[model samples]
Target: GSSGSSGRMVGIRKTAGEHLGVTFRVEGGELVIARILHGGMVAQQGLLHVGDIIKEVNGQPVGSDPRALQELLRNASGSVILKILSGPSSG
Candidate 1:
């Protein structure tokens, strides 16, 4: 489903000086998410799909701040469970 406008590909990875630095933007009150750098391990996960809203990480709410997101991505020692709100709506 992740090919064009209707779907997308998102992969977040780590960076130096920062644990997990990512690039994301907001469009039409919705988050357009993806990684800055491609061709990495995260891109291979396939666990994430485009248009998936990350709601929680490590049992913490992700919308609180950027730090929350950073923390979740960094401390994912073994597993990083992503609470993604996914579906379709017609309005």
Candidate 2:
């Protein structure tokens, strides 16, 4: 009845997969969510999808370089946080 559009909350979280269940890639210059699990349920139930371009990690903006960006992900303790957009390569 009363909530925001598909704009995703302030900073969403993920506690599934035991190891962040998410696969990321640089799609259209944004760190995109490549995939998650088989037939994926990671973002199907509440607030995510396969192509949800991950914009931030651990309260910090995503940067260039996979190893540099992923370096933060590696120590994120699995309970990761991010900002994402689910649309065309329009970020």
Candidate 3:
């Protein structure tokens, strides 16, 4: 697989009742951030951006598990870690 960038890991904290603040979509066998929800955790942090591919979650490969990923995010209590590959380079 050819990801545009090497990617990086992000540690995010989702409060008990707070949201992950992002939406995901499957593209080219990869899970990517479709959009960053306004006023959400990630959006507020300003680290991640749209079009970035989610490589891993909590130290495990994402591996085309959209449903499980959604479930995990939905049920997670706090401290979510995501390794993401940046979007295509614009140089």
Candidate 4:
């Protein structure tokens, strides 16, 4: 597994019907990954870690609303692309 870092972004494509085995929250208007379960749909591999950030959701700029975003993901289908990151820019 690639360990996390600073100033890195990646696109994670996940399918619906699995909840992605993860959890997130908003910090300073920025979405963040608060929890991750590495045994489900989120990890047929292990690219995902717990550095804790979310940027875009299927190209939608998702931020600061856990309830609404979770709803969408719950109902989402197809290859949903979530913009993720390794760490903060100035960390």
Candidate 5:
């Protein structure tokens, strides 16, 4: 887990048929992860966390539009690259 100032930025590669098992919300014009299911894909990955901001999806910038984000996730095929800014974690 990344922590402190300048939190880590990680790229997650997800398969087309896979699901992230997560929900999102927009706050302060940033797309943020709102929830992660207990047995979800993200949970299994053990990297993403609530409050983490999504910067890019498949090299496309993510805005404050929830619908756009949803569509991006839904339409992704093969492999999707997600550039994520992880939230600070406890030391």
Candidate 6:
């Protein structure tokens, strides 16, 4: 799970009951560019780039509840993967 320079998502899972299931973790209001290396197949349709802030996935919020974001990533069916925000900037 939390492996790699940023973070790699693995396995498949179902969407959470709420849209705000995803979130981000910011450190000292810094800006960290997130890289979405692999988004699997269906998730790739979302066309999440390798350099995505990962501000929000599945319509969830970030920058506060980053753990929530991990929760969503856990449900990556078809092994839909996603990255997370490190700093406070978005690209």
For candidate 6, the lDDT comes to: 0.41
Please, what is the whole-model Cα lDDT of each candidate in the order they appear? Answer: 0.47, 0.57, 0.72, 0.65, 0.69, 0.41
Q: Over the stretch 25-84, how does candidate 5's per-residue lDDT look in tens digits? A: 987677787888988667877887788777766557788886578667665666456777
Instruction: Highest lDDT: give the candidate number.
Output: 3
lDDT of 4 by residue, 1-91 (tens): 9988443444445566547667776766776766677777656546656555777766676757876777777777765666676556244
For candidate 1, the per-residue lDDT at 2 reads 70
Error of 5 at 23 (Å): 1.3
1-91, model 3: which lDDT tens digit per residue? Answer: 9878346767777756555756778777888777788877778889887777888777777678765676677666767777777656232
Count of steric clashes across candidates, in order: 0, 0, 0, 1, 0, 13
What TM-score does candidate 4 get on C-alpha atoms? 0.64
Instruction: Tell me the lDDT of model 3 at 81.
Output: 76
- lDDT per residue for candidate 6 within 1-91, as digits (tens), equals 8755544343234454322122233455422223333434324545333333554444344455555555554544443444444332453
TM-score per candidate, chains pooled: 0.50, 0.55, 0.73, 0.64, 0.69, 0.31
RMSD of each: 8.0, 4.8, 5.4, 5.6, 4.9, 11.7
Those runs of model 5 whose alpha carbons end farther than 4 Å from true positions after fitting are 1-13, 86-91
| Among all candidates shown, the one with the greatest TM-score | 3
- What is candidate 1's lDDT per residue for 1-91, written digit by digit as tens? 6754322323345443334335544444433344434454444555544455555554665663543465556655544455555544221
Runs in model 2 with CA error above 4 Å? 1-7, 10-17, 39-46, 66-71, 77-80, 89-91
Candidate 5, lDDT over the whole model: 0.69
On the 0 to 100 scale, the lDDT of residue 81 in model 1 is: 54
Find the number of clashing residue pairs for candidate 4: 1
